[PDB]
PDB file of C-alpha atoms in Angstrom:
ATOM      1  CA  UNK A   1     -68.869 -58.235  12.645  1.00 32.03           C
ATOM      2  CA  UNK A   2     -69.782 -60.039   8.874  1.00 28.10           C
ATOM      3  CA  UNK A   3     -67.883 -59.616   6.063  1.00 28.82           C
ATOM      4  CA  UNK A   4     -69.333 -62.380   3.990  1.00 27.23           C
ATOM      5  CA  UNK A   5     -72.964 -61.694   2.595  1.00 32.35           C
ATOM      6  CA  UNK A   6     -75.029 -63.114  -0.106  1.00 33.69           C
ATOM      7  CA  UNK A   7     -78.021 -60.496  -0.569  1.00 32.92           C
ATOM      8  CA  UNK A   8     -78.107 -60.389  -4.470  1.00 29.97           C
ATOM      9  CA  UNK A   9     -80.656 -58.026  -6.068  1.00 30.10           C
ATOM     10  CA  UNK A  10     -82.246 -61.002  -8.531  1.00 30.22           C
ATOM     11  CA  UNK A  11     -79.804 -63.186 -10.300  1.00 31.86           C
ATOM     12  CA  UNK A  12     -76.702 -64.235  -8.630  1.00 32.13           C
ATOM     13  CA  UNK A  13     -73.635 -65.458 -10.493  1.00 28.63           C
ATOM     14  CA  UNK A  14     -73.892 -68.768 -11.102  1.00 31.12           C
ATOM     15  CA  UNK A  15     -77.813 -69.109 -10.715  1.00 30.55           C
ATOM     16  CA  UNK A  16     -78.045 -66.244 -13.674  1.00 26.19           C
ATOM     17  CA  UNK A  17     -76.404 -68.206 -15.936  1.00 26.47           C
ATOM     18  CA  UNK A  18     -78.344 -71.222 -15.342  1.00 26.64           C
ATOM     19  CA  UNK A  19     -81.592 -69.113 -14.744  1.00 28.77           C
ATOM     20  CA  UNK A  20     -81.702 -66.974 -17.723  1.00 30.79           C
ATOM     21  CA  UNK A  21     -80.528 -69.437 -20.302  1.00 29.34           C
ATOM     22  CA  UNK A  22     -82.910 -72.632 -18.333  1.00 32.07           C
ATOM     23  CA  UNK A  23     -85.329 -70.371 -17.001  1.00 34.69           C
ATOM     24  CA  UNK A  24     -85.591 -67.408 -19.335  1.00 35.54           C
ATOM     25  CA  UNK A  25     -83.981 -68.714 -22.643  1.00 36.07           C
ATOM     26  CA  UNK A  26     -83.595 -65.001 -23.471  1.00 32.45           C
ATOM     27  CA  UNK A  27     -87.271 -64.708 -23.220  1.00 31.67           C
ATOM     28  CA  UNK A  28     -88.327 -63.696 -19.711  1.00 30.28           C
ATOM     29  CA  UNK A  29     -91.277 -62.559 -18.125  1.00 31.95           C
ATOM     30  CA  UNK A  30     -91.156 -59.271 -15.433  1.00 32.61           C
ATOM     31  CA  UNK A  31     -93.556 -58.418 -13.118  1.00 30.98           C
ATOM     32  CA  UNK A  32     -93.751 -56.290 -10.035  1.00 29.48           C
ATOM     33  CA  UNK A  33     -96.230 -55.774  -6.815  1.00 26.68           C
ATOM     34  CA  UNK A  34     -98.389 -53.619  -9.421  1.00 25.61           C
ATOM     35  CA  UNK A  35     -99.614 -56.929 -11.076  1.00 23.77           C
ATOM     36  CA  UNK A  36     -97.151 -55.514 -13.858  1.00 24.14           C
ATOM     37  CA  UNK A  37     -96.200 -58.260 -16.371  1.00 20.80           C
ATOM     38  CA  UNK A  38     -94.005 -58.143 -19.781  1.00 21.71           C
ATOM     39  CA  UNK A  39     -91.694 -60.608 -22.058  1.00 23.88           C
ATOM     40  CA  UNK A  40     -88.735 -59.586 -22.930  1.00 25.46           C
ATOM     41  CA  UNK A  41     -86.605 -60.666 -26.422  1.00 24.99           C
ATOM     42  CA  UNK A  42     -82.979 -61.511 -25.887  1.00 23.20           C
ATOM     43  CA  UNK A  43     -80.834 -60.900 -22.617  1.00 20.11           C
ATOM     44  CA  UNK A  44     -77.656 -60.802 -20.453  1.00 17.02           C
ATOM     45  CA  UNK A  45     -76.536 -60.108 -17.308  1.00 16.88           C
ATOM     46  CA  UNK A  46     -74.296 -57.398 -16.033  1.00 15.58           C
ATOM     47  CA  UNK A  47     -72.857 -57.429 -12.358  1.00 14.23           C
ATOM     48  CA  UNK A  48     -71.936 -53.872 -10.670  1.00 14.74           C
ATOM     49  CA  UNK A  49     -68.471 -53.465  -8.677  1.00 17.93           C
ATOM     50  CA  UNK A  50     -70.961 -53.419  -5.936  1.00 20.03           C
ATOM     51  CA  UNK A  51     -73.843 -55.331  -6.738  1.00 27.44           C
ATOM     52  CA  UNK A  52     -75.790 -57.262  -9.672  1.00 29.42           C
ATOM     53  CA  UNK A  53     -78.277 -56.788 -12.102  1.00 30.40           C
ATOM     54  CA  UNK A  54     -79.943 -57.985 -15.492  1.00 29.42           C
ATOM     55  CA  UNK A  55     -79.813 -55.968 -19.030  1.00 27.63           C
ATOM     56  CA  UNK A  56     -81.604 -57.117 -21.928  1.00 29.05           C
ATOM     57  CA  UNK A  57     -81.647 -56.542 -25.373  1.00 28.54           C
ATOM     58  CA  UNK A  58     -85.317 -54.919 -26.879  1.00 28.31           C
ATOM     59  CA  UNK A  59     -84.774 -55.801 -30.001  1.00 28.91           C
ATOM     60  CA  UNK A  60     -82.951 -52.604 -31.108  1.00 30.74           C
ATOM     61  CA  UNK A  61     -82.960 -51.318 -27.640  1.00 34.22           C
ATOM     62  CA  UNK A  62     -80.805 -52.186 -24.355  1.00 32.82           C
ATOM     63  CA  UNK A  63     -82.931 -52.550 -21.574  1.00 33.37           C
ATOM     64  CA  UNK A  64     -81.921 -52.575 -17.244  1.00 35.83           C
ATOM     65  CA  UNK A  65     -84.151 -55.443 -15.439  1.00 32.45           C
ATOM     66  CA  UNK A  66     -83.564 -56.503 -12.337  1.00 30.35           C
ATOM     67  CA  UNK A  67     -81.115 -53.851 -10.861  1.00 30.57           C
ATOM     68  CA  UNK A  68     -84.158 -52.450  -9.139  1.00 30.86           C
ATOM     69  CA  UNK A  69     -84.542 -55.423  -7.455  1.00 34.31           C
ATOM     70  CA  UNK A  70     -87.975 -55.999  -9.349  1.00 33.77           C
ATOM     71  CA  UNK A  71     -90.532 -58.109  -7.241  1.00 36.78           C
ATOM     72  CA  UNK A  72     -90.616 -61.151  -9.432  1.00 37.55           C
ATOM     73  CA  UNK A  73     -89.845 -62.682 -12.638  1.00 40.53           C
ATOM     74  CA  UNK A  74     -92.310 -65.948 -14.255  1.00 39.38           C
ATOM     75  CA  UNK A  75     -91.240 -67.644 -17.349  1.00 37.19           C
ATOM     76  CA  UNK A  76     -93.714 -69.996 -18.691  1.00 41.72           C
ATOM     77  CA  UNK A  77     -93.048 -73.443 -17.351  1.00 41.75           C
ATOM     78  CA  UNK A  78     -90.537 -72.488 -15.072  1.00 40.33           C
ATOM     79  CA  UNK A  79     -91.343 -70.394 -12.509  1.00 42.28           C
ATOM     80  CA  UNK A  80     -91.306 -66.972 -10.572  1.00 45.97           C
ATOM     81  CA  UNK A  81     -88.299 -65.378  -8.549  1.00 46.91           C
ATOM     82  CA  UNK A  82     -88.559 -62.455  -6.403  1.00 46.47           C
ATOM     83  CA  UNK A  83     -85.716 -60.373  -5.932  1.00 46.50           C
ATOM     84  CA  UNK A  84     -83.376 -63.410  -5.426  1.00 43.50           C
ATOM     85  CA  UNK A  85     -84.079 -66.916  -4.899  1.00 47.19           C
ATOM     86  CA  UNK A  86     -84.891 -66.541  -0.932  1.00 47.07           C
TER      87      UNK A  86
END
């Protein structure tokens, strides 16, 4: 019946470049439907044969966020995005 979709976990593949350069600038904030809330140093995105999802760098340690499909994401002056722009 549909073949073309556009479900993305968080960041897409345009809209991540834009968003986590513009709207992260490497520093982003996470937080989830427990109130849960946490800046994160440095970060890139990584997109799945099947899906997408964000890994940043912890300063000495590489980090998965976003491939959970993590409730929302605020960065200071920008703004918050839950699971995808939708």
């Amino acid at each position: 019946m549909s073949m073309n979709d556009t479900y993305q976990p968080i960041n897409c593949d345009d809209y991540d470049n834009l968003e986590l350069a513009c709207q992260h600038h490497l520093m982003l904030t996470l937080e989830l439907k427990d109130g849960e809330k946490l800046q994160a140093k440095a970060s890139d995105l990584v997109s799945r044969k099947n899906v997408e999802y964000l890994v940043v760098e912890a300063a000495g340690e590489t980090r998965e966020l976003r491939l959970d499909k993590i409730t929302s994401f605020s960065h200071p002056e920008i703004g918050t995005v839950v699971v995808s722009e939708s």
